[PDB]
Amino acid sequence: RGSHMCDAFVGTWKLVSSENFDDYMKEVGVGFATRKVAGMAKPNMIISVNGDVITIKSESTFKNTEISFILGQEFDEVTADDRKVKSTITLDGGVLVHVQKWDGKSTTIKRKREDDKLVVECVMKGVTSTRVYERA
Numbered sequence: 001r002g003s004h005m006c007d008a009f010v011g012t013w014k015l016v017s018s019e020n021f022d023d024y025m026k027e028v029g030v031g032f033a034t035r036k037v038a039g040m041a042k043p044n045m046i047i048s049v050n051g052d053v054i055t056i057k058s059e060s061t062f063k064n065t066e067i068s069f070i071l072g073q074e075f076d077e078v079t080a081d082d083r084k085v086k087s088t089i090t091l092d093g094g095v096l097v098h099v100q101k102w103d104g105k106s107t108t109i110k111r112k113r114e115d116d117k118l119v120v121e122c123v124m125k126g127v128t129s130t131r132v133y134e135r136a
């Protein structure tokens with residue numbers, strides 16, 4: 001199989017900046033202690049593609065997580081803050097768009113390549129957080 005546009009996300013990434021993440025987590029409903037510990041973490045994100053399957057791993061002192069998925073196909077996800085959600089991830093004009101649904105709520109996580117960075121924009125209702133990753 002040949003190259004895919006989504007190969008631009010493949011690699012090992014490290015968190016270098018975070019804005020408004022505590023307020024985003026508050027809007028999602030994350031409790032005090034999890035917010036405090038999760039907000040300290042500086043995760044590494046490892047993204048790989050094998051055929052139609054994309055795998056995103058996150059390693060940190062807070063939690064280690066791994067999801068594998070096919071674009072447009074819903075899957076079960078237990079998030080780092082221990083929500084059990086239904087997730088669907090699609091590609092929209094170069095942007096990975098990840099929607100998590102649970103308990104009648106939903107949040108959208110967008111991942112995009114910007115210069116040499118991977119920029120993650122998390123939205124819950126009117127509250128947005130921006131997390132920026134660089135190559136490890």
Ligand SMILES: COc1ccc(S(=O)(=O)Nc2cccc(C(=O)O)c2F)c2ccccc12
Nearest residue numbers: 025030038041062079080081109120122131
């Ligand atoms: C480090 O603590 C966390 C990690 C991951 C998630 S998440 O799995 O639900 N989605 C998500 C949200 C924000 C940033 C990223 C990112 O990529 O940096 C992300 F993937 C969390 C959700 C709530 C509270 C803490 C979370």
